Structures are given as C-alpha cells and as structure tokens.
Amino acid sequence: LDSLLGQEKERFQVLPGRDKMLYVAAQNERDTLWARQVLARGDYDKNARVINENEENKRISIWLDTYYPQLAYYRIHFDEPRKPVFWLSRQRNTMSKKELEVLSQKLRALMPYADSVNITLMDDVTAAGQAEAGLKQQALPYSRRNHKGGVTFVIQGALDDVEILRARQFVDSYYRTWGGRYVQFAIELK
Amino acid sequence: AAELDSLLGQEKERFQVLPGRDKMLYVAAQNERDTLWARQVLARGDYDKNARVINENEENKRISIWLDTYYPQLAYYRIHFDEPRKPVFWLSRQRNTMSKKELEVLSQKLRALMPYADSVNITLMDDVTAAGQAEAGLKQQALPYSRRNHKGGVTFVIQGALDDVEILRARQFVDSYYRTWGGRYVQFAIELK
Amino acid sequence: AAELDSLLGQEKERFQVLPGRDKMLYVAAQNERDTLWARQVLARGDYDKNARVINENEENKRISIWLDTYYPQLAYYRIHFDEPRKPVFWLSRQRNTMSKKELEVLSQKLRALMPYADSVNITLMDDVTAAGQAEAGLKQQALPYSRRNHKGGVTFVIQGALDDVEILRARQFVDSYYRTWGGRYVQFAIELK
Amino acid sequence: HMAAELDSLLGQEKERFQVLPGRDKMLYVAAQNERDTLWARQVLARGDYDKNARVINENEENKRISIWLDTYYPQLAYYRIHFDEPRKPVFWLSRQRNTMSKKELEVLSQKLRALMPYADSVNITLMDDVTAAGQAEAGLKQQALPYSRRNHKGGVTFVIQGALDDVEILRARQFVDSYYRTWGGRYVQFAIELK
Amino acid sequence: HMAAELDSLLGQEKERFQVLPGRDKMLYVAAQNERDTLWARQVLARGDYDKNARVINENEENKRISIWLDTYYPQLAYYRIHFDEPRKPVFWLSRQRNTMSKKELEVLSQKLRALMPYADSVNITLMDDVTAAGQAEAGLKQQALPYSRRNHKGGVTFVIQGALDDVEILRARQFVDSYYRTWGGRYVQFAIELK
Amino acid sequence: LDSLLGQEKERFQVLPGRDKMLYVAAQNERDTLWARQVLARGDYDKNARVINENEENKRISIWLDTYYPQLAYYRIHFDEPRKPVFWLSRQRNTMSKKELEVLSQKLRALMPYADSVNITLMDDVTAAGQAEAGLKQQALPYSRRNHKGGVTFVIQGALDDVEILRARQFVDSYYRTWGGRYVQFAIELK
Amino acid sequence: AAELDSLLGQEKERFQVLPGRDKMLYVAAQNERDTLWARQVLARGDYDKNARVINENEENKRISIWLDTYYPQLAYYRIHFDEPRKPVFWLSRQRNTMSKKELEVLSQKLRALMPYADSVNITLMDDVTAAGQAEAGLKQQALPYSRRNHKGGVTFVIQGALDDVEILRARQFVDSYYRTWGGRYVQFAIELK
Amino acid sequence: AAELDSLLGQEKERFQVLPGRDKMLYVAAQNERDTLWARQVLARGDYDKNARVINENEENKRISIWLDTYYPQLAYYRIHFDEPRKPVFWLSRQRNTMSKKELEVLSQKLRALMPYADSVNITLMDDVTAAGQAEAGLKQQALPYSRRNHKGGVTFVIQGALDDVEILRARQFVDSYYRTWGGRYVQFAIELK
C-alpha cells in the first residue's frame, strides 16, 4: 500500500460522460472554483462541468431525500470517479441483492461520468467504533449517547484553542469518510 | 405581587458583611468582579487575616468538594445565596434517597460548614421542572435543539447552522441556566456540522 | 419643548410588574440581559408558575408568529411597548386593506394575546416616512448607499469601502433603525467589492 | 477536438512568469497574482531591471484600462479584460448594451492594442447579459446560499440572505471574488443582508 | 475664585440631554456622544417629533461647520468648535496663522451664530500653535509612548514608534481620540510607524 | 467595615496642593483622560493637573530609580490622596527610623497634594503568601520559583480562554496592590 | 558535508510503510496533518484492521505513558524518529543512574514496545547542552529572557514588552525546541506585565 | 529578456551547504521557517558543533550590530544574500564619506565577519532611487500618502481611511519594500484618523 499512499494525483481529471458532457473532477472547493472559472473564460460551460466529492454527495442526497427517504447510508467516495463507492448501513439495510443493483443503477443515471456505481455495506459498529478510537488518538475525552437514528459523541473536558482546533480537524476527517448521518459530534458547554 | 418588586430591585446594598461562628467576617460579593474588588480593599486596610470574601460560585465549589467526600452519591443541583445568611440548597426529589430526618442532619452539617449561615434551607426540586425549564428556555430563545436523555441526566444538543450573534446568545442562556440549576443534571452541548 | 425635556430625562423603571387579565403577573424588562436575570429570579422563588417576563423583541416575535397564521397578508412594521399597558402597533397606510371596522377587531385579538395589555392602539404609518427615515439616518452617519425597490419594500445597499468603524457605526445605525421599524419593509445590506 | 483543449487549460506545467516585449522597448513580466507580482517586483529591484522591465497582472491592468475607458469611452457597458494569454487579451463587452458598430469595435480594438504595448491583438467578444446574471445565480445555488435578486439601473444585485454561519460567510466571500475575477463588478453586484 | 469652577465642570449632576430652541423654530436636543444621539434619535422617531426636533452632538456639528468653512473660509487655520455649552459654542482658531482683523473676526462670529440657530453667541478664541503641539508631546509622554516629531506644511506629525504591545496600542488609540476631541486633526497628526 | 466597602467615591477630587496647583485625583486611565480634556477646554492647565495611582507610582519610581536605587519596596496606595501609603519590604528594609522619615519627607516634596506621606513596612512572606492563596481561590495550578530579587509564579496547566482570562484579571488585582517588584507571574508554554 | 545535503533534502518519500513483529503494518507520517490523511486513506480501502498510522508526537506520548509505569524515575528527553525503523532515544547524562548493561535492556524493552523498530538506539545527551541551546535560541531570536533554575530543570521566563508578531515568533521557536528536546527538562513561560 | 526569463523561473535550492574560511559548514535558508527546521536537523545529528544556519534577515541584524560599534556613522540600507558567497552591500552614494581606499577595507572586515563569503561586493545606491521606489510602489498598490523629510531620511505617512485589506496589502507592500531596502532611510507609517 506504499503505492496507494505515495500515489500521486492529477489535480484535474477530464472525464467524458455518458451524456456527451466532459466532467472535470476536482479535489476541493478551491480548485472547483478555479476550474469553474477557466470553463467560463473559454465558453466551455455548455460542454463541461466541474465536480467534487462534497457537491456530488449533496446532490445525490437531495435525490435520495425523495425516492429513497428511508435509506440508511453514510457517504459516497469518489477516489476513483469512474467507479463511485456508495457506503450503506448493513444493519439497517432492508433490500434484496435485487433492489441494491436497482439502487446502483439509478445512481448511475445521476452520474454520467460513472461507468458503474459500486455499493458497499458497512458495519454500524465499525462507524461508531472508529469515531471512539479517533477520539483517543487525538486525546479528547468524551461520552457516548445512543439515540433514535444514531449516536452522539459529546466531546467534553476543558478545551484550549489548540484542543478546540484538533477536535475540529478530526471531526472533519471523520465526516469526510462517514458523513454526519449516523454519528454526529458535539462539544459540551461548561 | 409586592414581593416581586422586592426580589427585583436596585435596593440591595453592594456587599453584605456577616459575622461568623468562627469569629471571622464574611463579606458577600455578588459576582466575580465585585469579589475581586473586595479582596483588594481588605488587602489594603489589612483585614485579610480577620475577614474573608465569598460569593455563590466559590461557595458552590467548596460545598461540592466537601460533598464529594461526605455525600458522594447525592443527586442535587445548586445552592443559592440570595440570602447569604440563609443559603437554600436544591436537591432532586425524584432521586433523593434520604429520610425527613437524615435531611435535617444534612442541613446541620451544611450549617456547620457555613459558619456565617443562620440556617440552611433544603428544597426538593422536581427533576421534570429542571429539564422542562431548559427546553422552555431554548424555545424562548429560538435556538433549535435535540434532547438526548442519558444515565447522568439530560443533554440538550444545540443544533442548526450557527450564526455568530446566535452563538453568543446560546452561551448566555446556558450561563443563566447553570447559575440557577448547576450543570450536574442538565448539560448543553453544541453540535459540530 | 418641556414635553420633550422630560421624555428624554425620564428614569424608566428597570422592571415593571403588571397583573394581567389571565391572573398572571408580567414583568417587563428593557432588554435581553434584564430578561435573563429576571427569568432567573422567578425560577429561584417559585414565581415561574405565577409570573412571566416580557420584552419588546420577544413579544414582537411571538406576535409575528400569530399574525403569520390569522393575518398572513398583513403589511405592518413593529410593535412599540414603551407603555406596555398600551402597546402601539405601527401599520402601513399605503398597503392597508381594511375598514375602521376590521381594525379594532384586530386590536381586540391582539388585546387577547397580551393579557397585560389593557388596549392595543393601532397607528397608521407612512411608507414614505419609513423609507425616508432610513434615507436620512444614512446621511447623518455619512454612509454612501443606493436604493433598490422590490415586492416587499426597499433595500438600501450600503456601498463604498468600509473601515472596521465604518462597518460598526453602520451596524449600530441599522440596529437603531430596526428597533423603531422592524425589518419587514426597508432592508439593509452591505455591498461586497 | 476539445477536451485536449480543456486538458491544456488546466495544465500545471505553465510557467509561473512570462516575459513579453513591448512596442515601447519596455519588457512586461506577466505575473498571475498579487504575491508573484510582489515577488518579481522585488527581484527586478535587486538586480537593477526596474528601468526596462515592468510587472503586470490582470487586476492592475483591468484598473489602468478602466481609467482609460473613463475618459475615452465613458458610456461603454463592459465587464473585464482577460489575460490568460497576455499576448492576446480578451475583452468582454455586453451585446445587449453595445451601441458601437462592427468597424467602431475594431477601432476600440486598435486603441486598446495601442494602450497595451505587449499585446499582439485585443480580442473583443460580445457577451450576453442574461448569461452574466445566469452565472451569478447558478453559482450562488451551487454554493448553497439563499438570495434575493434586485434589478436596477446599471444591472443586477444579489442580496445574500439567511442567518449566515462563519464558514458560510467565507464561502460567500470566496465565490464572489471568483465571480468578480471573470465578470467584474460593473453589472452584477452582491450584498450581504443585515438582519 | 476657580476650584469651585473646576468642581462644577467635573460635576456629574449635569443633565444627560439638553433641549434648546432655535431661531428656526426647530428644537435642538444636544446629546453628549454617538450612543445618546442614537438613543434620542430613536425616542424622537417613536413619538413623532422628527419634524420639529433635531439631535446635535459636537462631532456632527464639527463636520457641518467644517463643510461650511470649506466654501466660505477655505483658507482658515482653525482647530475645532467646543459645545460644553451648546448655547455658547467656543471656536479655536490659530493665533499665529490668523489673517483676519478684529472686526473681520466678529463677522465670522456672526455668520457662525447664524449657522447655529440654537446658539446665543459664538465665542472665538485664538490659540497658540506651540500650545497645540506642546500638548501633543506632554500627553504622549504622560502616556509613555516613544515618538518622533515631523514638521511639515499644514502643521506637525507625531510618528509613534517602538515595538508596540497590544495593550500599548489601545493606549495610543485612546489618547489620540482624546487629543482629537479637543484640538481636532487639522494641524497635529499622529501615525503608528511600521517596523 | 460595612462602611469602608459600601463607601461611595466622588469621581473626581479637587485638591489644592502646597505648590498653589489644584490636583484632580482620578481613579482610572479613562477618567484621567477626560478630566485632562476638561482642563484644556477651560484653560486650567496652568493651574491644575490630573493624577491617578498608576501614573504617580511610575513617577515616584523614576525618582527612586536615581536617589534610592537600592530601595526594596512594593507600591504606593492613594485611596486617601492627602495621605499616600508607601509599602516597603520589611525583610529587605535597611534604614533607621531616622532615614525612613527622611524618605517620607522627600516623597512629600514630590507630591504637593500630600499632607503627609505614610510609610508602612510589609512582610515579604505576606506578599508571596497572598499570591499563592489567590491562585487557589481563582483555581489556577502553579509552581513557585524563588530567585535573586523575588519570586515567580509560573501558572501552569492547560488553559482555556476563560482560564486565561480569569488569571489575567487576578494578576492585575494582585499587581494593583503589590506591584510587580517582588512577585511576577508567568504563564507556562506547553 | 555530503551527509548534510542528505539530512536536509526534499528526497524522502512522503509516508514510509514498516513491517512489524506483530504482523501489523506501520505507516510513518511526518506530521499531524499527513497522519490524518493516511488515517483517511486506510479507512476507505479498508486497511484499518491490518495497518496502523504513526508519527513522532503520538509515539512519544505512548512511550511516555509506558515509561511512567516501568521507569517512573527516568531523566530523559525525547525519542526522535527521523529513521522510524531505528528510533533514537535521548536520556540525560548527568542524571542517568543506569549501568551500561541496564541500558541495553531498556533498549530492548523499547525495542519490544516498538514492533516496527529494527533497533532502538540510546544516546546520553548533555544536560548543559540542553539549556545552552535553549539560551542560544532565544538570543538567535532576539527574545529577551530570564533564566530560573529549579528542581525539575530550567525555566526560561520570556520577558519584555511583547509585540504581536514577537509573540508568534516566540511560540514558534518554543515549538521547535520542544520537538527536538521535549518539555521535561527545559520549560518556557511568558511573563505577565 | 531571456536573462530575466531565467532569473524569474529559477529553482533556487532550499538549502545550500557552504564550507567557510573558519572550517565550519554554513547552511543558508530562505526564511525563518526553514531556518528553524534546519537548526532542528543540526541538533539531532551533532552537527551543531560543526555547522550553522544563516538567513538574510538574521545576518542583516548581526552585521548591523557590528557596524554599530566600528562604523557608527555609516549610512547604508541592507545586505542582499541572493548569492551568499558574494553578498552585495547597498551603500548610499549621497551620504558616502569614504575613499575607494576606505571601501575595500570595510569590504574586507565584512568578509572576515562572514566566513562563508568569498568576497563582499559594496554597491553605491541612489538616495533618490531609494525614496522614488517607495513613491512608485505606493501608487501601484493605490495607497494615498504624504511625504515628510527628516534627519535620517523620509517618512511616508500612509493616509486615507483603511479597509482590513487596504491595511493588509499595505503591510505586504511595506514588507516587500523593507526586504529590498531595510528601514534605515525610508520609513512607513499609518496615519490615525
């Protein structure tokens, strides 16, 4: 996995999709904006679009909010944008290996640059466990609070600037991977 | 109704100076800053050896330390010092395990603990009233929240996209609630989005 | 002259306790700080079941909500509680669609909604005065701006580059403005350069 | 054959600075932003080039040409000039508000060519006001900001509404710089509403 | 008999606001600062006095008279007008730079009296430029700030030097507002040096 | 001492002094400035001066720096400005009840509004003890560090905003009374 | 002299992936942010059960906890991981009480504690060098200070009127010094004026 | 043209290790961040006895100090180390009081002071160019200002009201300026309104 980690990204990736549009895949808000600026300076906007993981997750969610309001899931990962990876909750997953490839397909329809949309069932306890572990790695005390549709980790203790900062970065780290759909975090007020 | 006007008035003297069973003088300041000022005064007129300055926050700390040792199980809230010579102590009704008799002993132990107090009133407060008032206060304040009951007590997770001006308000309410109730049963947390 | 001399030099009372037509006591505070502190006092002494705290901003909100349901098409500004027993309600002349008949009827429901209010005094205000006052105050403070009409009312885009103070004084003026007029007509915005 | 075009436009192999010779026997070094500009300006100072070399960036050149248009074309409805190719600046004028004629517009082109010693030419392209405002809205949405549009004399304003988180504000700030770099501020404006 | 004078000048029994009638059949309410002004302005609005009453404060009146002097006395070397007694504004002109004559200065007085409907009179006092600059230095020292003086055309600048602590900066800010309220900014300036 | 504490101050005090000048005694920087502004609007500056405890301490120090460079002392208190109270270090005080009234007198000369200048010998251990006690009242952990000409209280621990703030106010409280001539405080850097 | 160029170079790969005696993979990130990124990667490609991410700061915490229990008296400084597979551990010479033999055991215990390490070098560093370099670094940085020796070690009280830009520099140096030396022998504090 | 093309597109080396005439190695860093990190590296590997880190700003300070003693009346700007083996020293033509003879002598002492320097190249700079460059850069950035001469040199009081950005860009420009010229002649100040 030396490879995978020292693996070197191309900053933008231009991906013709099934609708004749070229998609340009960016890695963060800043690059999105910039590329989105190039497209307008060159009259490409009728022919290309800029995408990133965060915006597509939001878009997909919006759709899911309507046609799958019941679905129990985490996030979509676009490391390989030609095969997005959709993380679903195994323990609350209520669909036949039929219906899941119906889901897959419908998401494919939403993403013209996707060749296939991979579905992957994730473990509800793995989600929550890794939140806990991370909290210890970054040395923040906490208390866990189960509830109806998830788990809350109320980060506690007195908290310095730095101690506020580190917790903020970790929470974004965790959110980048898991979303805030199962686990949410919160700071306690003393 | 006339009582209200009294409770609610610019009448009270600034500081209030209590004689103590321990032959020390207690001066009751109303807040941190006033306390610091009193402390300064004593130091200048050399009373620091005969008089002591107190306030609600500090005394609650001290009573708490003590209680950690002598009543480590007590389900309680806060001691109020509106009348510093008759502190009023709020315990949970629902979670109170003592007898009518055990409580007067408490009252007395606390009386002893507070050499300036004449008595130490004890009022069993209603756990439901406590969370009720947190909830009503959040609504009063248009601050959306989610209620999570737990083992210790209740955590109100404050939610929503959070404005600057709406953060400061939340902090301010939460302080208000703690002053009255303490933090031992109800907790407030702000959710990270 | 002297009429004014007093109005300005008045020593408004910090809290005013007012029995209402629903038997409850109503304590009227000048701002959110006093509201919290009062709301505190009522908690400590078991008034909470008997009395309530009110303030201009909160009441304006609560009443907005009720009007949202039973008068959703109503064009108004804000409610002034300088005299809480007689709260003045500023309505728009120019967008008024109601007989002297229909008025007083509203006046009476609003009266219900405010047990402390003996009577609610509706007053017809001039859309031109509303806008004209923003226009003037903006010059007094020396803030360049541009007017943009809409459905709803007016948006005053505050223009020009802006100091930390040019920003501040502007934030203040606007607070003063909204205190008087609400933000349902005239809007304020800071332009981005 | 575009896509290979996109590819080269998003290329990062493009040289930081670019030295261009001008008809005025001065050398123009095109920097890409304020920091680089200040860097090159510093390099020139130290090695005594300040007299025969000059640094330019799109922001500064947009101000100088604007001062110029203030005097010679004081009623021109335009947007901004782009310097992605400093040898061939492109200048966006509005179609719907352009009062000039084909040949008149080639005059303009010539005078700007003259005003920019280092340019081979100056491309004028007419732009659709509807596109300008359309792009403001779409990006405002892509950025998940609630807003109210306001038409007026010199174009359109977008009043940015909502209670606005700290991070939501910086998000709006960033997008608006972005919008301005492309379209300038002369037609579309953005404001943050005070609540 | 002064000291009893000092005593009454430092008195805190003085009424917050002051209503004064003007020759223009408007009423001027003199507030003492921006906040009070905004308060009274709010009280007037609510009780419909906006048409016959107006709020004034020394800062706003100094700007209005300055606009006026820009046109009618555009070379006058002056400082500020003081409104400790709104019925008798005092106006500090420089002695050493005053070109006017005794009677000329009573003209000025009359025109300002006219421009300020609510004043019984307008006291002109000539002031010593050396005093102005002298007071800048002394207070700069009392405030324990290192500085360099710079003479120039329109007076004197005081460049505030030193590495400056956060609290030392706010200290300088405060003292300079203070200096400005009394002497205005038209002669003495203050700058913070960049290191 | 109910009196003494609910005792109500006059904001400014006008005190004719032995040099024919009127001194106006203010309680803080802000009031100083304002009164110092009144004096200039009324041409009193040739006849009055504004004073406060902080500026006079600084002035006196400057003098002491020259004629008593050896002196071991804390601060001067001007609660009663007609009798300033000078706190000296008993344990490092090396002067005869003669020389002390010579000191007193010389300070009197510096302060025309002073009728007499009171000297009061304070206890080196009282200074330092009260620093320690205060640190506990305000619940800040610390370590004490003796040295050549004093004592340092390195406030330690992780420190919140609030926890930074409270320590700052207390340190000013203590300094108002004792000066930073014997005890200095410091925050540790983690 | 050629060695310098190596130490000092943009050569090194980003992460470095070590096989461990415990049949887990160790990835060595160089800083917090890189660590967080690695952690993210593993989570996505599901290696979180077979590979672990490490860095100098975290490992020093862990070794410290351990040592608190098994060598509670040790006078030491910090472990460096420039070569993650040969950690170098710095102990005090002056305050070292162990024999040549006791130290190799240590080395070994630590070796065991670090399943990815090949060896664990031990270098006795000079207490004087340690404070020397703090002092030289403060001068290097024109940041006036006062040196206070104590029981634990040495506190350099940073002094003088303190600029904003000079605070940030001080913090930055102090971080630099801790990275190399830790905080166990030399401490920095900022004096309050 | 091409001369420039390169100068600008150069890939300056991050650290340059340079043996000196005193046998020590000198590592030359571009800025304070790299200096710290390097200074770190030298600590870890026992170079500290052999090598040193230098940077333009620090060296400028150190050399200022030496000049303070043995040339206290010298009118100069700053030392440029773009090529450290040949550091250029900008002196003032207009205030030069020295023969070609006396120069080279200085050149040689400076050479001593910098074991890494093969030769120190003195260069006579134009007081008018010094000032004129501040004048120009100030317009480029669009910052209103006023000039005030003195004993010493020029103070450019930056005038006009100021955004958080008008402030910033101004703080930057000035840094760029001082990088090139030092602050011994031209001064910069922000006017207070």
From Swiss-Prot, chains A, F:
It is found in: Cell membrane. It comes from the Bacteria. Signal peptide: none annotated. Required for invasion of epithelial cells. This is Protein PrgH. It comes from Salmonella typhimurium (strain LT2 / SGSC1412 / ATCC 700720). The chain holds residues 173 to 362 of 392 of the full protein.
From Swiss-Prot, chains D, E:
The chain holds residues 170 to 362 of 392 of the full protein. This is Protein PrgH. Required for invasion of epithelial cells. It is found in: Cell membrane. It comes from Salmonella typhimurium (strain LT2 / SGSC1412 / ATCC 700720).
